[PDB]
Amino acid sequence: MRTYTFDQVEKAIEQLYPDFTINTIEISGEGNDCIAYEINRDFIFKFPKHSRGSTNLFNEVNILKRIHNKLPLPIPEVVFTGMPSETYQMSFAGMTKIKGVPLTPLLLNNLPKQSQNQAAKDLARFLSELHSINISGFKSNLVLDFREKINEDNKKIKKLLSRELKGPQMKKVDDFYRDILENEIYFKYYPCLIHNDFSSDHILFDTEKNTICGIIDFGDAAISDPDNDFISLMEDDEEYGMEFVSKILNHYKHKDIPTVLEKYRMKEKYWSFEKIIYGKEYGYMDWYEEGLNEIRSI
Ligand SMILES: Nc1ncnc2c1ncn2[C@@H]1O[C@H](CO)[C@@H](O)[C@H]1O
Protein backbone atom coordinates (compact mmCIF):
# COMPACT_ATOMS: atom_id res chain seq x y z
CA MET A 1 0.00 0.00 0.00
CA ARG A 2 0.91 3.60 -0.54
CA THR A 3 0.32 6.89 1.30
CA TYR A 4 0.82 10.42 -0.09
CA THR A 5 2.45 13.65 1.06
CA PHE A 6 0.51 16.94 0.87
CA ASP A 7 3.25 18.03 -1.60
CA GLN A 8 2.47 15.00 -3.91
CA VAL A 9 -1.28 15.48 -3.76
CA GLU A 10 -0.79 19.10 -4.80
CA LYS A 11 1.78 18.29 -7.61
CA ALA A 12 -0.59 15.64 -9.02
CA ILE A 13 -3.47 18.15 -9.20
CA GLU A 14 -1.23 20.97 -10.50
CA GLN A 15 -0.03 18.81 -13.47
CA LEU A 16 -3.56 18.46 -14.94
CA TYR A 17 -5.21 21.50 -13.43
CA PRO A 18 -2.60 24.26 -13.36
CA ASP A 19 -5.04 27.15 -12.72
CA PHE A 20 -6.73 25.52 -9.73
CA THR A 21 -5.22 27.17 -6.64
CA ILE A 22 -5.09 25.10 -3.52
CA ASN A 23 -5.28 27.13 -0.41
CA THR A 24 -6.03 24.47 2.19
CA ILE A 25 -5.39 20.76 2.09
CA GLU A 26 -6.20 18.24 4.87
CA ILE A 27 -6.70 14.48 5.22
CA SER A 28 -10.53 14.11 5.66
CA GLY A 29 -10.46 10.33 6.08
CA GLU A 30 -9.43 6.98 4.72
CA GLY A 31 -11.20 3.90 3.32
CA ASN A 32 -9.81 0.57 2.17
CA ASP A 33 -9.51 1.90 -1.34
CA CYS A 34 -8.45 5.52 -0.95
CA ILE A 35 -7.11 8.26 1.34
CA ALA A 36 -9.37 11.36 1.13
CA TYR A 37 -8.09 14.94 1.04
CA GLU A 38 -10.30 17.95 1.74
CA ILE A 39 -9.26 20.82 -0.54
CA ASN A 40 -10.34 24.44 -0.08
CA ARG A 41 -13.08 23.02 2.20
CA ASP A 42 -14.90 22.70 -1.16
CA PHE A 43 -13.69 19.40 -2.62
CA ILE A 44 -12.84 15.88 -1.54
CA PHE A 45 -10.07 14.35 -3.61
CA LYS A 46 -9.54 10.59 -3.43
CA PHE A 47 -6.10 9.08 -3.90
CA PRO A 48 -5.86 5.31 -4.38
CA LYS A 49 -3.89 3.33 -1.83
CA HIS A 50 -3.31 0.56 -4.40
CA SER A 51 -4.36 -0.68 -7.81
CA ARG A 52 -7.42 -2.52 -6.61
CA GLY A 53 -8.31 0.76 -4.93
CA SER A 54 -7.79 2.57 -8.26
CA THR A 55 -10.26 0.32 -10.04
CA ASN A 56 -12.98 1.09 -7.42
CA LEU A 57 -12.29 4.78 -7.75
CA PHE A 58 -12.53 4.59 -11.58
CA ASN A 59 -15.82 2.72 -11.01
CA GLU A 60 -16.97 5.31 -8.44
CA VAL A 61 -16.34 8.16 -10.95
CA ASN A 62 -18.19 6.49 -13.77
CA ILE A 63 -21.13 5.67 -11.49
CA LEU A 64 -21.22 9.20 -10.03
CA LYS A 65 -21.49 10.65 -13.55
CA ARG A 66 -24.15 8.17 -14.79
CA ILE A 67 -26.36 8.90 -11.75
CA HIS A 68 -25.74 12.63 -11.55
CA ASN A 69 -28.90 14.62 -10.90
CA LYS A 70 -31.28 11.68 -10.99
CA LEU A 71 -31.58 11.00 -7.25
CA PRO A 72 -33.44 12.81 -4.38
CA LEU A 73 -30.54 13.26 -1.95
CA PRO A 74 -27.27 15.11 -2.75
CA ILE A 75 -24.33 13.04 -3.93
CA PRO A 76 -20.74 13.99 -4.69
CA GLU A 77 -20.35 15.47 -8.14
CA VAL A 78 -17.12 14.56 -10.03
CA VAL A 79 -15.13 17.72 -10.86
CA PHE A 80 -11.53 16.64 -11.27
CA THR A 81 -10.17 13.34 -12.54
CA GLY A 82 -6.62 11.96 -12.79
CA MET A 83 -5.02 9.75 -15.42
CA PRO A 84 -4.35 6.04 -15.88
CA SER A 85 -0.81 4.73 -15.49
CA GLU A 86 0.74 1.23 -15.35
CA THR A 87 -0.40 1.02 -11.68
CA TYR A 88 -3.70 2.96 -11.45
CA GLN A 89 -6.75 3.06 -13.63
CA MET A 90 -7.19 6.53 -12.17
CA SER A 91 -4.52 8.47 -10.27
CA PHE A 92 -7.12 10.53 -8.30
CA ALA A 93 -10.58 12.04 -8.49
CA GLY A 94 -11.86 15.23 -6.91
CA MET A 95 -15.54 15.49 -6.05
CA THR A 96 -17.69 18.18 -4.45
CA LYS A 97 -17.70 18.09 -0.71
CA ILE A 98 -21.04 17.26 0.86
CA LYS A 99 -21.25 18.92 4.25
CA GLY A 100 -22.54 17.19 7.32
CA VAL A 101 -21.77 14.36 9.70
CA PRO A 102 -22.28 10.57 9.56
CA LEU A 103 -25.77 9.66 10.76
CA THR A 104 -24.51 7.38 13.61
CA PRO A 105 -27.02 5.04 15.37
CA LEU A 106 -26.40 7.20 18.46
CA LEU A 107 -27.14 10.41 16.55
CA LEU A 108 -30.32 8.88 15.12
CA ASN A 109 -31.69 7.51 18.38
CA ASN A 110 -31.26 11.01 19.89
CA LEU A 111 -33.39 12.77 17.28
CA PRO A 112 -37.11 13.51 17.85
CA LYS A 113 -39.46 10.89 16.36
CA GLN A 114 -40.42 13.21 13.54
CA SER A 115 -36.84 13.54 12.20
CA GLN A 116 -36.30 9.80 12.63
CA ASN A 117 -39.39 9.04 10.58
CA GLN A 118 -38.27 11.57 8.01
CA ALA A 119 -34.76 10.03 7.76
CA ALA A 120 -36.39 6.62 7.28
CA LYS A 121 -38.51 7.99 4.46
CA ASP A 122 -35.61 9.94 2.87
CA LEU A 123 -33.51 6.83 2.86
CA ALA A 124 -36.34 4.71 1.26
CA ARG A 125 -36.91 7.28 -1.41
CA PHE A 126 -33.23 7.46 -2.07
CA LEU A 127 -32.79 3.66 -2.49
CA SER A 128 -36.02 3.32 -4.39
CA GLU A 129 -34.72 5.74 -7.10
CA LEU A 130 -31.19 4.22 -6.96
CA HIS A 131 -32.57 0.76 -7.52
CA SER A 132 -34.65 2.05 -10.45
CA ILE A 133 -31.76 3.35 -12.45
CA ASN A 134 -31.42 1.88 -15.89
CA ILE A 135 -28.66 -0.74 -15.88
CA SER A 136 -28.48 -1.38 -19.65
CA GLY A 137 -25.15 0.51 -20.08
CA PHE A 138 -23.24 -1.06 -17.14
CA LYS A 139 -20.69 -3.63 -18.29
CA SER A 140 -19.78 -6.90 -16.51
CA ASN A 141 -17.08 -5.15 -14.45
CA LEU A 142 -20.04 -3.54 -12.56
CA VAL A 143 -22.35 -6.56 -12.64
CA LEU A 144 -22.04 -8.71 -9.54
CA ASP A 145 -24.18 -11.79 -10.08
CA PHE A 146 -24.35 -13.33 -6.66
CA ARG A 147 -24.40 -16.95 -7.75
CA GLU A 148 -21.16 -16.29 -9.75
CA LYS A 149 -19.69 -14.40 -6.76
CA ILE A 150 -20.48 -17.37 -4.43
CA ASN A 151 -18.97 -19.86 -6.89
CA GLU A 152 -15.93 -17.62 -7.50
CA ASP A 153 -15.44 -17.08 -3.69
CA ASN A 154 -15.63 -20.83 -3.17
CA LYS A 155 -12.83 -21.39 -5.68
CA LYS A 156 -10.75 -18.56 -4.05
CA ILE A 157 -11.28 -20.04 -0.54
CA LYS A 158 -10.07 -23.37 -1.84
CA LYS A 159 -7.08 -22.02 -3.66
CA LEU A 160 -6.12 -20.00 -0.57
CA LEU A 161 -6.88 -22.46 2.24
CA SER A 162 -6.30 -25.92 0.74
CA ARG A 163 -2.99 -26.22 2.66
CA GLU A 164 -4.34 -24.36 5.72
CA LEU A 165 -7.27 -26.64 6.71
CA LYS A 166 -7.70 -30.23 7.68
CA GLY A 167 -10.22 -32.68 6.18
CA PRO A 168 -13.27 -32.06 8.44
CA GLN A 169 -12.73 -28.34 8.33
CA MET A 170 -12.67 -28.07 4.48
CA LYS A 171 -15.65 -30.39 4.54
CA LYS A 172 -17.47 -27.78 6.68
CA VAL A 173 -16.50 -25.13 4.07
CA ASP A 174 -17.92 -27.42 1.36
CA ASP A 175 -21.17 -28.08 3.34
CA PHE A 176 -21.66 -24.38 3.98
CA TYR A 177 -21.14 -23.44 0.32
CA ARG A 178 -23.35 -26.34 -0.84
CA ASP A 179 -26.24 -25.04 1.43
CA ILE A 180 -25.86 -21.43 0.29
CA LEU A 181 -25.94 -22.68 -3.36
CA GLU A 182 -29.03 -24.82 -2.75
CA ASN A 183 -31.06 -21.94 -1.45
CA GLU A 184 -32.80 -20.25 -4.34
CA ILE A 185 -33.82 -17.23 -2.34
CA TYR A 186 -30.26 -15.71 -2.64
CA PHE A 187 -30.07 -15.66 -6.44
CA LYS A 188 -33.52 -14.80 -7.73
CA TYR A 189 -33.50 -11.01 -7.45
CA TYR A 190 -33.97 -8.40 -10.13
CA PRO A 191 -30.45 -7.14 -10.63
CA CYS A 192 -30.04 -3.44 -10.31
CA LEU A 193 -27.87 -0.61 -9.27
CA ILE A 194 -27.03 -0.77 -5.60
CA HIS A 195 -24.83 1.37 -3.33
CA ASN A 196 -23.35 -1.77 -1.79
CA ASP A 197 -21.74 0.00 1.11
CA PHE A 198 -24.90 1.40 2.37
CA SER A 199 -24.15 2.19 6.02
CA SER A 200 -24.26 5.00 8.56
CA ASP A 201 -20.72 6.15 7.76
CA HIS A 202 -21.94 6.96 4.20
CA ILE A 203 -25.15 8.75 5.19
CA LEU A 204 -24.40 12.44 5.92
CA PHE A 205 -26.62 14.47 8.17
CA ASP A 206 -27.32 18.16 8.75
CA THR A 207 -27.82 18.80 12.46
CA GLU A 208 -29.06 22.32 11.87
CA LYS A 209 -32.07 21.06 9.86
CA ASN A 210 -32.22 17.54 11.34
CA THR A 211 -32.20 16.06 7.86
CA ILE A 212 -30.02 13.77 5.82
CA CYS A 213 -27.99 15.84 3.34
CA GLY A 214 -25.94 13.40 1.35
CA ILE A 215 -24.95 9.92 0.22
CA ILE A 216 -21.24 9.27 -0.32
CA ASP A 217 -18.72 6.55 -1.12
CA PHE A 218 -19.91 4.88 -4.28
CA GLY A 219 -16.72 2.83 -4.79
CA ASP A 220 -18.55 -0.51 -4.27
CA ALA A 221 -21.73 0.26 -6.25
CA ALA A 222 -22.55 -2.59 -8.63
CA ILE A 223 -25.44 -4.24 -10.36
CA SER A 224 -26.66 -6.76 -7.84
CA ASP A 225 -29.35 -7.53 -5.28
CA PRO A 226 -31.20 -4.46 -3.93
CA ASP A 227 -31.59 -6.30 -0.64
CA ASN A 228 -27.85 -5.58 -0.08
CA ASP A 229 -28.64 -1.98 0.76
CA PHE A 230 -31.06 -2.95 3.57
CA ILE A 231 -28.94 -5.62 5.10
CA SER A 232 -25.85 -3.30 5.44
CA LEU A 233 -28.09 -1.05 7.66
CA MET A 234 -29.44 -3.84 9.91
CA GLU A 235 -26.21 -4.81 11.73
CA ASP A 236 -27.17 -4.54 15.41
CA ASP A 237 -24.07 -3.01 17.13
CA GLU A 238 -22.34 -0.97 14.42
CA GLU A 239 -25.59 -0.01 12.56
CA TYR A 240 -29.35 0.93 12.89
CA GLY A 241 -31.18 -2.31 13.93
CA MET A 242 -34.47 -3.72 12.68
CA GLU A 243 -37.05 -1.25 14.04
CA PHE A 244 -35.58 1.71 12.09
CA VAL A 245 -34.69 -0.41 9.05
CA SER A 246 -38.26 -1.83 8.90
CA LYS A 247 -39.51 1.75 8.52
CA ILE A 248 -37.22 2.11 5.48
CA LEU A 249 -38.55 -1.20 4.11
CA ASN A 250 -42.22 -0.12 4.49
CA HIS A 251 -41.63 3.40 3.00
CA TYR A 252 -39.89 1.55 0.14
CA LYS A 253 -42.94 -0.75 -0.15
CA HIS A 254 -40.72 -3.85 0.08
CA LYS A 255 -42.81 -6.95 -0.53
CA ASP A 256 -40.82 -9.71 1.24
CA ILE A 257 -39.21 -8.51 4.45
CA PRO A 258 -38.72 -12.14 5.66
CA THR A 259 -36.36 -12.73 2.69
CA VAL A 260 -34.38 -9.64 3.74
CA LEU A 261 -33.86 -11.13 7.21
CA GLU A 262 -32.87 -14.42 5.72
CA LYS A 263 -30.27 -12.71 3.50
CA TYR A 264 -28.97 -10.90 6.56
CA ARG A 265 -28.42 -14.08 8.62
CA MET A 266 -26.63 -15.69 5.70
CA LYS A 267 -24.39 -12.65 5.23
CA GLU A 268 -23.64 -12.65 8.97
CA LYS A 269 -22.05 -16.12 8.78
CA TYR A 270 -20.55 -15.49 5.30
CA TRP A 271 -18.43 -12.68 6.84
CA SER A 272 -15.63 -15.09 7.90
CA PHE A 273 -15.01 -16.17 4.31
CA GLU A 274 -15.33 -12.61 3.13
CA LYS A 275 -12.60 -11.78 5.67
CA ILE A 276 -10.24 -14.34 4.19
CA ILE A 277 -10.83 -13.22 0.59
CA TYR A 278 -10.71 -9.52 1.39
CA GLY A 279 -7.78 -10.49 3.54
CA LYS A 280 -5.48 -11.35 0.64
CA GLU A 281 -7.13 -9.17 -1.97
CA TYR A 282 -6.85 -5.90 -0.03
CA GLY A 283 -3.73 -6.70 2.03
CA TYR A 284 -5.33 -6.96 5.49
CA MET A 285 -3.50 -9.76 7.23
CA ASP A 286 -5.34 -9.29 10.48
CA TRP A 287 -8.68 -10.03 8.66
CA TYR A 288 -7.23 -13.07 7.07
CA GLU A 289 -6.06 -14.51 10.43
CA GLU A 290 -9.42 -13.82 12.16
CA GLY A 291 -11.48 -15.38 9.43
CA LEU A 292 -9.05 -18.34 9.26
CA ASN A 293 -9.25 -18.86 13.02
CA GLU A 294 -13.07 -18.70 12.78
CA ILE A 295 -13.28 -21.33 10.06
CA ARG A 296 -10.86 -23.41 12.11
CA SER A 297 -13.17 -23.32 15.09
CA ILE A 298 -16.74 -22.45 13.90
N1 LIG B 1 -17.90 13.91 -1.43
C1 LIG B 1 -17.64 13.89 -0.12
N2 LIG B 1 -18.10 14.85 0.71
C2 LIG B 1 -17.81 14.78 2.08
N3 LIG B 1 -17.01 13.73 2.52
C3 LIG B 1 -16.56 12.81 1.62
C4 LIG B 1 -16.87 12.88 0.31
N4 LIG B 1 -16.30 11.84 -0.32
C5 LIG B 1 -15.64 11.13 0.60
N5 LIG B 1 -15.80 11.73 1.79
C6 LIG B 1 -15.24 11.44 3.20
O1 LIG B 1 -13.84 10.74 3.29
C7 LIG B 1 -14.11 9.35 3.83
C8 LIG B 1 -13.39 8.09 3.24
O2 LIG B 1 -13.54 7.92 1.81
C9 LIG B 1 -15.69 9.25 3.69
O3 LIG B 1 -16.34 8.13 4.41
C10 LIG B 1 -16.22 10.72 4.03
O4 LIG B 1 -16.07 11.25 5.34
TrEMBL record:
Domain Aminoglycoside phosphotransferase as annotated: residue spans: 41-255
Domain of life: Bacteria
InterPro entries reported for this sequence: AGP_Transferase, Aminoglycoside_PTrfase, Kinase-like_dom_sf
GO molecular function, a single term: metal ion binding
Ligand binding (guanosine): 98, 217
Binding site for ADP: 33-34, 46, 96, 98
Keyword Ribosomal protein recorded: no
Residues that coordinate or bind adenosine: 96, 98, 217
Residues annotated for Mg(2+) 2 binding in this entry: 217, 220
Record's keyword terms, sorted: Metal-binding, Nucleotide-binding
Pfam families: APH (PF01636)
Residues at which Mg(2+) 1 binds: 202, 217
NCBIfam families: APH_2pp_Ie_IVa
Protein's UniProt name: APH(2'')-Id
Protein's organism: Enterococcus casseliflavus
Encoding gene, per UniProt annotation: aph(2'')-Id
